[PDB]
Design an enzyme around this catalytic site. Structure first.
Site, PDB file in Angstrom:
ATOM      1  N   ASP A   9       0.873  -1.172   0.000  1.00  0.00           N
ATOM      2  CA  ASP A   9       0.000   0.000   0.000  1.00  0.00           C
ATOM      3  C   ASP A   9       0.939   1.260   0.000  1.00  0.00           C
ATOM      4  OD1 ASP A   9      -1.443   2.308   0.972  1.00  0.00           O
ATOM      5  OD2 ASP A   9      -2.993   0.918   1.667  1.00  0.00           O
ATOM      6  N   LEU A  13       0.538   1.143   6.379  1.00  0.00           N
ATOM      7  CA  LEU A  13      -0.462   0.515   7.231  1.00  0.00           C
ATOM      8  C   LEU A  13      -1.157   1.655   7.992  1.00  0.00           C
ATOM      9  CD1 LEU A  13      -0.112  -2.695   9.389  1.00  0.00           C
ATOM     10  CD2 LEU A  13      -2.064  -1.190   9.019  1.00  0.00           C
ATOM     11  N   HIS A  14      -2.131   2.206   7.272  1.00  0.00           N
ATOM     12  CA  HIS A  14      -2.830   3.379   7.701  1.00  0.00           C
ATOM     13  C   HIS A  14      -4.185   3.038   8.304  1.00  0.00           C
ATOM     14  CE1 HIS A  14      -5.253   3.467   3.887  1.00  0.00           C
ATOM     15  NE2 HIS A  14      -4.195   2.763   3.480  1.00  0.00           N
ATOM     16  N   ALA A  15      -4.920   4.083   8.702  1.00  0.00           N
ATOM     17  CA  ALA A  15      -6.109   3.890   9.471  1.00  0.00           C
ATOM     18  C   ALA A  15      -7.077   2.878   8.964  1.00  0.00           C
ATOM     19  CB  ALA A  15      -6.777   5.208   9.842  1.00  0.00           C
TER      20      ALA A  15
END
Length: 88
Positions: A9, A13-15
């Site tokens: 991504d 490793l986001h919300a």
């Protein structure tokens, strides 16, 4: 039980993915840890996972220990694929 994957991504490793993963991990009795660089975190905690600030290209390892570990690892792997965090 464990698996490693590279985060593809572009935002890391986001919300969104962290939230989805924390939810999914929380269903399991197993202890589910996420390892990145020198950091280890509880995948069931969105705060822990966000604090890790995992960025693209990072190789992570997910370790599940417990009675439902085998299911947990697959569930988590599929979740990562589904959220496009990693490549299937």
């Amino acid at each position: 039980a464990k698996f490693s994957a590279i985060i593809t991504d572009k935002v890391g490793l986001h919300a969104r993915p962290a939230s989805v993963l924390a939810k999914e991990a929380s269903k399991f009795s197993s202890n589910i840890t996420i390892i990145a660089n020198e950091k280890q975190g509880n995948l069931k905690s969105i705060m822990n996972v966000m604090a890790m600030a995992i960025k693209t290209g990072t190789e992570i390892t997910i370790q599940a220990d417990g009675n439902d570990a085998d299911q947990a690892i697959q569930a988590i792997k599929q979740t990562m694929i589904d959220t496009a965090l990693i490549q299937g």
